Every structure is written in C-alpha cells, then in structure tokens.
Write a protein that binds this ligand. Sequence first.
Ligand code: 7Y9
Length: 439
Amino acid sequence: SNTFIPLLAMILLSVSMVVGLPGNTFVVWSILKRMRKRSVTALMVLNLALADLAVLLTAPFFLHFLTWGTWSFGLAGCRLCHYICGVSMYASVLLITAMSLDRSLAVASPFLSQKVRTKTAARWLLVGIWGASFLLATPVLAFRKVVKLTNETDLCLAVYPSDRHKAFHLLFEAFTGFVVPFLIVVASYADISRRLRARGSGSNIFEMLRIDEGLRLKIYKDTEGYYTIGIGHLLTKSPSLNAAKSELDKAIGRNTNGVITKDEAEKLFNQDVDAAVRGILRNAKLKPVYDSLDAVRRAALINMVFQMGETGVAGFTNSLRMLQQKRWDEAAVNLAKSRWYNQTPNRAKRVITTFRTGTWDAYGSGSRFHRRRRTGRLVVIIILAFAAFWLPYHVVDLVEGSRVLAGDQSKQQLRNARKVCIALAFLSSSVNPLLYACA
Ligand SMILES: CC(C)(c1ccc(O)cc1)c1ccc(OCc2cccc(COc3ccc(C(=N)N)cc3)c2)cc1
C-alpha cells in the first residue's frame, strides 16, 4: 500500500489539471473579454474562479515532486507553493462566506440590498477579502522550509519548532479556514430556510392576502383613519403626508413620490409577515398551535393575526386548541358563532374553509404557482462541492492538534491518510467549471 497512495494522488492532481486548467481559464476569460457590465455575481465567480486557477498552476510542481522523489525548487519553491495554496483556500472560502452571507440579506430585506450591493462596494470588498486572505496564510511561509534528508533526497514539509507550535497552527487553519465559515454559512443559510417557512412556499400566501386585505399601490387611509400602503403595511403613527410619504421612501430606498410596484408591495408584505410571525412565535398562547399547523393552515393564523392582532386572536382559545389537536370540524363549526364571523363573513367563510380542508381550494385555482428559488440555488451547490472536498483535509488538522496534546506507529496512518485528503482537495478548484457546464 506504499505505492497506491502516490498513485491516487497523482491522478487526481492530473485530472484537476486536465479539467481545472481549461475550464477556469475559459470561465475567467469570458467574464473579462466578452462582457461590458460585469455583474457582482460575475465578480465573485471571477475571483473565485481566478484564485482557483492559481492553485492549479502549482500542480505541475507537486506532481514532479511526487515522482522525482525530492524537492527541486529551493527554499523559495516550497516556501511559495504552500503560500499560494494557502492563500486560495483562505480567499476561496471567504468569497463563499460572502456569497452565502449575502443571499441571506436578499431575503431578510431586499430593499437594503439595492443600497448595499453596489459594484463599487463589492469590488472594494474583494480587496478586503484578498488582503485579509494574503495575511492569514502568512504563517505557512514561516513554518514550511526544505530540509536535506539524504545526500540525494531533500524533502520539504512544515518544520514546527515544538509540538505546541504545530498544534495551534494546525487548529488555527481549521477554525479560520473552515470552521468559522462553516458556522457562518450555516447560520445565514439556515436562517433563510427557517424564514421561508413563515413566508410560505411560492407566492401562495400573498395572493391569498390580496383577495382579503385588499391590494392598493398608493398611500391611503386605513379603516381607523391612518396612513397605510399595500396590504395593510402601516407606514407611521403620524398625521402628516410628507412625514408618511418620506417614511415610506426610507423603507424602499427610492423616491416613490407615493407609488410602489407590484413587487415592492409584495416584498414589503413579507416584512409584514416576517415580523408578524415572531410575534406569534414569541406569544404565550398561539405559539404551540402554530407549530402543529401544516404549511397550508398556517397562513390563516397569519391571516387572523393580520386581521385582529395576536392579542385579539389569542381570545379564541377553544377554537385555538381544537386546531392544535388536529380536529378541524369542531373548530370550523365553533368559529361560525364569532362576531368576527358576523362583522366580516366573506373573509371568515373562506379562512375557516382553509382550516377544515387544508387546501387553497376556497381561494383560487392555478394563479399562484411560482419558482421562488433564485440563481442562489446554483450558489448553494458550489459551497457543498467545496465543503465535501475540504472537510476530509480539515478533520485531520482538527484531529492532529487534538491528539498532539495526549500521545508514533498508531498515528503513522495520518500522514498517509492526510496525503489523499490533502490531494482530494485539489479537485475543488476544478469543480466550478463543471457546475457551470451542468446546464
Ligand atoms: C499530494 C502531494 C503532491 C504529496 C506530496 C508528497 C507525498 O509523499 C504525498 C503527496 C502534496 C504535497 C504537499 C501539499 O501541500 C500543499 C496543499 C495541501 C492541501 C491543500 C492545498 C491547496 O489546495 C487547494 C487550495 C485552494 C483551492 C481553491 N478552490 N481555490 C483548491 C485546492 C495545498 C499538497 C499535496
């Protein structure tokens, strides 16, 4: 088994050359030669597919070192190749953090993105990522030097003066390289999938509310004589129009002069359910029942809460728990005697109908189907191919530093096992062009 690990590491590094060199050289080409307005999503890809190219430029050296038997490029060679390799890991993973940290701001509030996602404020970030990536790989050029092993064989690897030195740096490139990003991209990218559960899949929750609360695209006066716009979005508790009108422009970022788009009315409505669902989940009485209700019957809890406020809908306890206990017919007929049913029966006869049937049958037929998922669905695979390629390597870094404080011959497998994990990761630089050729 002494011969097959070098055999495995020399094909992957060569298939990464035959696939990663041409693809990245093309991907980096189009974004420069054949484009006028380079989108922000075309710069992330650019630098990410630009950095991935530099790592592969060092591959012909490790392959030579893999077969020749000794290093051949002097202190600079092995001081450099690891620095170039160490900077792409850092640059690549931070770009993937930013890309993933951003698709959580495009759903948290899509009106701030227009005022924050500026090509001038994206380019002036890349330098930051690059600069803050050029620095975090600096220990690798201080600790990796060539040592003459035999008259005819000088090997190169990290020379750590003490094992405490080795430990922390092996841990240091794990938290910062992977664990800090893996934790960040898990908070942001799971906040989203936990945000949409309130917002409901597709636009289905919106059109339901349009029929009910009325869709108006200009500032008007509410039922109680107060300024609102859209589906009940309260602009301000204030009398003045210019105060009310200006208050809106702050939350949209553009000079509306009193008018918003069908889109702007919908995004703004999501903030009206996003913030109306925390009130539910932070409410003593309607949190438990809501958690039990399926995706369909949830929007109607969001509907009544939109209607009368949580403090008000919290009153129908006996009709509340009957839902929680999954008995609809005894909650459908029980809600029939409320003043809410009497004062407004066109919207009560259908909200209640969505409970006992658990479908959108009472509201519409075939005008709600959308593909809410955006191009970030592609952005969510280039992080997984990345994570699946870089976890094998880092667990060893994580296990060496951990097991270098207590306890050779049992650990003689790690470097033999690290060799492939370290060499497997040479394919992540060659994974974007196939994902772009996935279509
Ligand atoms: C496998 C080989 C040739 C060897 C040699 C002697 C032997 O007996 C057995 C094996 C070897 C030697 C040294 C070595 O250290 C460099 C290294 C180690 C892990 C990782 C990277 C960067 O990878 C990246 C960085 C960034 C990206 C990116 N997406 N932008 C992709 C891949 C560099 C690596 C391999």
